[PDB]
């Protein structure tokens, strides 16, 4: 159970350091004064009933026809064709972490993400409001109903974006992460937006540097408008960070251009 | 860079006595002996004429 | 920079059992020793008062002393009590009697080598040594008697550290033991010759603090314990977290004490809010101010009223302004100048901590040094005479070998600290 | 003999609000954005031998 | 930790019957000597050993030496309820009594009986770690009693030495008598009791008769009773050495405090809530009232008015649930007392100390059931007027020469009265010089 | 998502100077056990294998 | 380098069975002889105690005399009986009578040939030989009387090789035997000469090591004689495993004689600690230095304090750093350099062995040569010369021969080793 990659959890906490149950990834594993290895054949490595449920369970065509849908209205109202800042803010209403440290996603909540689209609405008359309404309502009832709940009655945010971004590698998020890292000075879960702003890469960007078409400062200034608290105190936390690589992540295909544009995108030392 | 030393404790019960009581004046003070020391007194003096 | 802790007698090992309760809950020790806290402010100063068991384990740097193991069976089966070591309790097999003459010299020769062996292992397990700290009664009988012996072979051992003790005195309305004036008169004595600086807390202020302020229905020496155990944690607070203007017990000792033979202070410690009452009035640095001057948050008898203060300190702990700090100790110094000495220019010193204690947004611990506590050794002195001069319980004292000279060196020795008091209080520029 | 008394039952009803951390709430801070003027860069000194 | 209880003659084992029931009943040991078996409290407790010590099998035995001259007594011990739980060899007995006569114990059969009991004694003492003293009952009217009473003292004074000796004492009532001879053997006791004790409590059983009829609402008390209450008394000062409080008192403390000069060792005793159950019921029983309670003379169990005299020290003993501010609000009230006075060179007055643990209940008691009580023990110069009344009952008989020839033969000199006498008059001159204040001798 | 076997661990209130109630009067014996002079392991907790 | 050992009288016997016990433990030998070990580190120096026997076994170089096969008759039925050599086993037909000249005249020259050859057959079976090692007790007598008799021949045969001795040595406040006395001035007059090195114990200071420092509550001579056989398998560690700075016992002897009469050592184990304490105190380099020093873990009943420290040697088992040791013999004879003789300036020798004793995470063995072993030999001459002049029980000594003149000489021999310490003691350079 103690592999490199086996997921478990033990119990509630029991110091005040934490505030819910949490679940614990091994990284690194020395046998070196190990005299008796045991195993059970044909059963699961570590606690992670979690990820099981996830995997044995099966959601409808529907739903995923009404995601997919949902994520072209965003692409195209909310952005303006570019995927990146379309998909980062599809997941802006959930946030929030919990004790668990999770995000979760409770019905209202997801009424007012598919409204948020743009997408379902029409002449401001009475009777079309209405069915804009109800038209709403159905589509959120359905992609609400095809997801696992815990107590409290929310879903999961991973597992949804699971179906709308896709499936991602370790890779890429340790690469993620160690950019982060990287960017903090601090140890707190923020980013300032100075950092952002003096460690960007507009400057050798071939659409400012060969082709002239943009210029530098230009699209400097408009990558520093999409984080979304930029005008009030300039702290971007670690969601928001991986909201936008979710989205980046989701456009590109290859590992060796999704590497490569990683790496070039952030002159840090 | 000092670390910890070992102790070996002293005997006190034959120092306390009745007959030889503490009077005034006679507590433990520590001072330290003074050290001389030498001031330069480059300052040229004031001469406005 | 380690603080070493000394319990003496039945009211030193209560006192300490509720300190390191208190100093448990602040840190997240749990009681059975292991780390349970939730910031690394905690972790960072934790050696100051504990030492480290392995696999986690932390232990006081603490010595408990008593000739009667009571006491002692009491704060083991406590619910902290697990948390003392085994090795640190010394004890004897006959009671002080409430005698100084045989705490001091029969059985106090008898154990007091097993108590230096065991407070030169703690002092030397150290860094490095700040000044130790003492909690006793002087009416008592091994109280006072080991606690004096003791320090006088600390001051033997380790001359150039501190030497603090918290005392409890005589109240001036009722006697808990008879022969208290003696006690009291010989302990003074020893402590005006080997103290740094002393303490001194009457437990009818603690009574009329709790009935008055507090309004509780029901009070037990656990609630007065807490009272004790809250100040003395809280004057060491600058020596264990950060702040804005750090401070140190040698720094309080240098700006306290003007001359060597005036080191007895008055304390007191401030937010404390009646049961009924936190809805009527708002924290703030002046209403902390104001609870800290008032005599009735004093822990001695003698009022300000009749004297002037040479000096005082104020240790504030929480998130507040240094611009309100001095001009509260600006304007409280100009309103009341006839209460301090004129010819020291600025009586008060202030400090700042960052960490308050927990559930409260702010707190400050005062410390004052006031001339009016001549009040107090005077009427001391009278008892002392009205009982010697009749050798009203003497037959005790010298059976057990005291030489009489040694009543009339304390008597002369206190009455001259009374008069310099007195003459301090009259000076004049001229 | 008789059992003792305990008095955990029947607390206030908001018991779960009170805090046990010592230090609840983190520190506050907030950044700006920088205006690049051209004294962001003009303006600045050259090494005192730099040759076309 | 340890206590020693010696119990002489028919006063002393009559009232050890009483005690050793309480503090069986208060600690839990069965008559058979072994705790219960049907409770499960898992932890195994040790408080009982200050008066009991266990073998190994789990038995309890305690200790305490029953002596006497007659086997009557010990015999009615031997033969009662409590005759599995004693040791044979601790309960000791002689063929025949003293005959009221101080000098037939003393010099002709105290003298060989007492050989046994010191060996006895030595015997317990060897099986203690931390013993602090000796406890004794005995009454100074009877001839055994006083006789051997004062030679075990003294053999106790010279072998233990420093070790103190408190004595719980029976002293010949004011109307109320027994025997005709009584003075000579109280005079001639009392003359070994000043050299040989730490502490003397007194106890006349015309006080214990009229608190039994006023306050208890017994009509024909009898000695069971009185046995009863003195055993409540010795719980309540022992209680400071067996469970947890506020301020313990060690029994080392109470010679510092109540002493000032060595011959002024005589203490009066009283005790606050002594009610009936119908009483009980209409009154409640606050710290302030029994505090005032023990200050009445109608409270004491010796018949003497310490109005007729000026205090020198008091200790106040407070067991059950007391708060220290209570005890320090009545203890300054009762200072207000205009009836009160204490002498002018005694300023600090008053020892306190305060238990958490509640008198027990006897099944068959009279006393009520309280969650608190007060017990006293103080040093006053109005002790003097009962010396001076058994001192001219014993010169009126002393000038005829009454009855001196009974203690001549047994083995007195006649010089011996006259010596005794004469000590017991300084006596009354010590406590009239020692109440004399000193603004008047400037 | 259920919790696992292990449970949560619940913690006290903090102590404030002020606002305490007598909680150490609400025992109804107070039965003093001798430790110092008897044991010599003394009430030193050790836990089960 | 093989070593020798000789087991005399009954306390030898009995303490040679518990000695050879451990030591197979630790090399892992079963009590068949078949190794079962389970690290290379163990078989590499097995020569050093064990001889090999046919197919697999080994067989310990060791002697076993007495003058009543009771005590062998009881080890050999033993749990470890079985690994002894049948032909090694010597004994007589009637006791020593705890009588010294007995043993060293009569029985004693009547089988000590018997001994010298069975010796000198393990001697020149070696490859090459190290020092004799002899276990036995000065206040008996076939130990005292035969033991002398069989050191005197081993150092006439063997001269250039190490003579080392452990022996007990009679409590100040109890005696054992009537006799002591005299035995133990005759063994001593013996062994100042004869010896190279003697370690010496107080049974009484192995009771308070038990009682104060371990606690058990119901110790067997089994305890003390594992106390004994731990720090007497401790001193020759280095010998028999690989470390940082190797050292021998004849490097100790060079390093811990000034004078070739200064031959007399106390001895301390460390990591002793009792089972309710462990949780409490973490092993470390300055607790192994802390309780090398304290005298309560010091075997002898004479009190460092009141002597000073000619020389000291301290072995370390265990990997650490060499700055913490060298670090620690500096501190402590820097801060009580009272207690050290000033005209030596380093008065310590450190030695470190990789391989700690199993189941403990280091320890320490202390060898120490202090002056303040000169009160115990004056205590003995005092009740010798007490004995003496009522010529007590001398008719048992003289009816076998003695003459007096003997016990003259060994009391004026043990008075002047007395003054030589003394002067020493107060010795000064000018
Ligand atoms: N309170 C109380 N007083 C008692 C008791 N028994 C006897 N007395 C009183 O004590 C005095 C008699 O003393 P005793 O104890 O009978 O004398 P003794 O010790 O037997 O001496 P001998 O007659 O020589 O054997 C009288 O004043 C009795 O009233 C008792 O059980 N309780
Ligand atoms: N504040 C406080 N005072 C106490 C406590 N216990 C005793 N005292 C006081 O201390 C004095 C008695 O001294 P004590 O400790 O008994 O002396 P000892 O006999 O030498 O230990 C009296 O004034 C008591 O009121 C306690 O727990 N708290
Ligand atoms: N430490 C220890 N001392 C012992 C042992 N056996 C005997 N002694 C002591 O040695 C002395 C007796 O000497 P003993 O061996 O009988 O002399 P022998 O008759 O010549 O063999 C006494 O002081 C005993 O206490 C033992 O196993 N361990
Ligand atoms: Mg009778």
């Known amino acids: 159970d103690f592999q490199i990659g086996s997921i478990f959890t033990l119990g509630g906490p029991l110091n005040q350091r934490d505030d819910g149950q949490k679940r614990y990834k091994v990284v690194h594993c020395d046998d070196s004064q190990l005299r008796t290895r045991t195993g059970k054949t044909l059963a699961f490595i570590g606690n992670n009933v979690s990820g099981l449920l996830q995997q044995t369970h099966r959601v409808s065509g529907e739903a995923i026809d009404a995601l997919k849908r949902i994520r072209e209205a965003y692409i195209f109202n909310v952005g303006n064709g570019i995927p990146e800042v379309g998909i980062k803010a599809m997941g802006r209403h959930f946030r929030k972490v919990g004790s668990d440290g999770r995000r979760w996603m409770s019905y209202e909540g997801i009424v007012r993400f598919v409204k948020d689209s743009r997408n379902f609405n029409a002449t401001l008359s009475f009777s079309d409001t209405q069915r804009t309404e109800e038209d709403v309502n159905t589509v959120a009832t359905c992609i609400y109903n095809a997801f696992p709940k815990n107590e409290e009655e929310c879903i999961d945010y991973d597992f949804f974006m699971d179906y709308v971004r896709g499936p991602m590698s370790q890779e890429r998020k340790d690469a993620v992460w160690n950019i982060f890292r990287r960017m903090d000075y601090d140890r707190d879960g923020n980013l300032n937006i100075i950092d952002i702003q003096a460690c960007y890469n507009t400057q050798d960007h071939p659409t400012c540097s060969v082709d002239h078409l943009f210029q530098s400062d230009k699209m400097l200034k408009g990558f520093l408008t999409i984080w979304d608290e930029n005008e009030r105190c300039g702290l971007v936390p670690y969601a928001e960070f991986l909201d936008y690589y979710n989205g980046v992540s989701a456009v590109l295909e290859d590992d060796k251009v999704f590497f490569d544009v990683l790496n070039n995108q952030w002159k840090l030392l | 860079f000092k670390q910890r030393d070992a102790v070996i404790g002293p005997i006190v019960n034959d120092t306390v006595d009745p007959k030889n009581f503490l009077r005034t004046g006679q507590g433990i003070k520590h001072i330290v002996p003074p050290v001389p020391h030498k001031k330069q007194h480059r300052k040229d003096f004031l001469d406005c004429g | 920079r380690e603080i070493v802790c000394v319990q003496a007698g039945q009211c030193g090992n209560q006192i300490g059992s509720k300190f390191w309760e208190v100093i448990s809950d602040e840190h997240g020790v749990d009681p059975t020793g292991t780390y349970q806290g939730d910031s690394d402010l905690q972790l960072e100063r934790i050696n100051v008062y504990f030492d480290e068991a392995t696999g986690g384990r932390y232990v006081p740097r603490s010595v408990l002393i008593d000739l009667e193991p009571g006491t002692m069976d009491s704060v083991r089966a406590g619910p902290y009590g697990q948390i003392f070591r085994p090795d640190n309790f010394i004890f004897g097999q006959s009671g002080a009697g409430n005698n100084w003459a045989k705490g001091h010299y029969t059985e106090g020769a008898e154990l007091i080598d097993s108590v230096l062996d065991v407070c030169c292992k703690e002092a030397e397990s150290c860094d490095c040594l700040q000044g130790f700290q003492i909690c006793h009664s002087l009416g008592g009988g091994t109280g006072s008697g080991m606690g004096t012996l003791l320090i006088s072979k600390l001051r033997e051992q380790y001359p150039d550290r501190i030497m603090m003790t918290f005392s409890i005195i005589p109240s001036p309305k009722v006697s808990d033991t008879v022969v208290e004036p003696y006690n009291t008169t010989l302990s003074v004595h020893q402590l005006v010759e080997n103290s740094d600086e002393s303490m001194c807390i009457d437990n009818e202020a603690l009574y009329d603090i709790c009935f008055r302020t507090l309004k509780l229905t029901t009070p037990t020496f656990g609630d007065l314990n807490h009272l004790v155990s809250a100040v003395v944690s809280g004057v060491t607070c600058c020596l264990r977290f950060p702040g804005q203007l750090n401070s140190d017990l040698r720094k309080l000792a240098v700006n306290l004490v003007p001359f060597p033979r005036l080191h007895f202070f008055m304390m007191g410690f401030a937010p404390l809010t009646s049961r009924g009452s936190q809805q009527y009035r708002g924290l703030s640095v002046p209403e902390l101010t104001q609870q800290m001057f008032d005599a009735k948050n004093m822990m001695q008898a003698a009022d300000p009223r009749h004297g002037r203060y040479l000096t005082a300190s104020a240790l504030f702990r929480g998130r507040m302004s240094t611009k309100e700090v001095d001009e509260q100790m600006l304007n409280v110094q100009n309103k009341n100048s006839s209460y301090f000495i004129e010819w020291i220019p600025n009586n008060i010193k202030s400090s700042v901590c960052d960490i308050p204690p927990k559930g409260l947004k702010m707190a400050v611990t005062f410390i004052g040094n006031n001339t009016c506590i001549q009040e107090m050794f005077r009427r001391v002195g009278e008892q002392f005479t009205l009982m010697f001069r009749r050798k009203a319980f003497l037959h005790w004292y010298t059976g057990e070998g005291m030489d009489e000279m040694e009543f009339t060196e304390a008597e002369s020795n206190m009455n001259d600290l009374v008069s310099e008091y007195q003459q301090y209080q009259d000076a004049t520029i001229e | 003999r008789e059992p003792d008394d305990v008095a955990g039952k029947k607390p206030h009803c908001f018991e779960m609000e009170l805090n046990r951390k010592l230090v609840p709430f983190p520190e506050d801070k907030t950044s700006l954005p920088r205006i690049l003027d051209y004294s962001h860069v003009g303006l600045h000194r050259l090494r005192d031998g730099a040759e076309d | 930790r340890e206590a020693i209880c010696i119990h002489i003659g028919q006063a002393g084992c009559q009232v050890g019957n009483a005690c050793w029931e309480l503090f069986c009943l208060e600690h839990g040991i069965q008559p058979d000597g072994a705790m219960p078996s049907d409770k499960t409290i898992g932890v195994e407790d040790d408080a009982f050993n200050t008066f009991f010590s266990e073998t190994g099998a789990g038995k309890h035995v305690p200790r305490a030496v029953f002596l006497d001259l007659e086997p009557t007594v010990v015999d009615e011990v031997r033969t009662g309820t409590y005759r599995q739980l004693f040791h044979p060899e601790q309960l000791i007995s002689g063929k025949e009594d003293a005959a009221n006569n101080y000098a037939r114990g003393h010099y002709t059969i105290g003298k060989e009986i007492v050989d046994l009991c010191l060996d006895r004694i030595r015997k317990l003492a060897d099986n203690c770690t931390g013993l602090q003293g000796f406890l004794v009952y005995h009454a100074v009217g009877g001839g055994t009693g006083s006789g051997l009473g004062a030679l075990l003292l003294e053999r106790l004074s010279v072998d233990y030495g420093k070790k103190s000796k408190l004595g719980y004492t029976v002293y010949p009532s004011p109307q109320v008598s027994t025997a005709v001879v009584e003075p000579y053997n109280s005079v001639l006791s009392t003359h070994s009791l000043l050299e040989h004790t730490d502490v003397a409590a007194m106890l006349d059983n015309e006080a214990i008769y009229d608190l039994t009829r006023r306050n208890l609402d017994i009509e024909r008390p009898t000695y069971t009773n009185l046995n009863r209450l003195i055993g409540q008394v010795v719980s309540s000062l022992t209680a400071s050495l067996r469970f947890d409080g506020a301020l313990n008192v060690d029994l080392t403390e109470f010679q510092t405090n109540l002493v000032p000069y060595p011959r002024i060792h005589f203490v009066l005793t009283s005790y606050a809530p002594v009610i009936s159950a119908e009483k009980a019921y209409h009154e409640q029983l606050s710290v302030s009232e029994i505090s005032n309670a023990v200050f009445e003379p109608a409270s004491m169990m010796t018949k003497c008015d310490p109005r007729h005299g000026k205090y020198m020290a008091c200790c106040l003993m407070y067991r059950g649930d007391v708060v220290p501010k209570d005890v320090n609000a009545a203890v300054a009230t009762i200072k207000t007392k205009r009836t009160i006075q204490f002498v002018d060179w005694s300023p600090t007055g008053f020892k306190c100390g305060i238990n958490y643990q509640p008198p027990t209940v006897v099944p068959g008691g009279d006393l009520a059931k309280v969650q608190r009580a007060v017990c006293m023990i103080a040093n006053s110069t109005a002790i003097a007027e009962v010396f001076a009344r058994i001192d001219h009952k014993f010169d009126l008989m002393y000038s005829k020469r009454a009855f001196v020839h009974w203690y001549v033969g047994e083995g007195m000199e006649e010089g011996e009265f006259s010596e005794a006498r004469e000590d017991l008059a300084a006596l009354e001159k010590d406590y009239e010089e020692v109440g004399a204040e000193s603004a008047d001798m400037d | ?49």
Do not use: W
């Open chain 6, 1 to 49: 998502y259920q919790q696992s076997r292990a449970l949560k661990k619940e913690f006290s209130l903090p102590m404030v100077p002020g606002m305490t109630c007598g909680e150490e009067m609400l025992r109804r014996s107070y039965h003093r056990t001798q430790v110092h002079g008897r044991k010599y392991d003394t009430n030193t907790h050790i836990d089960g294998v």
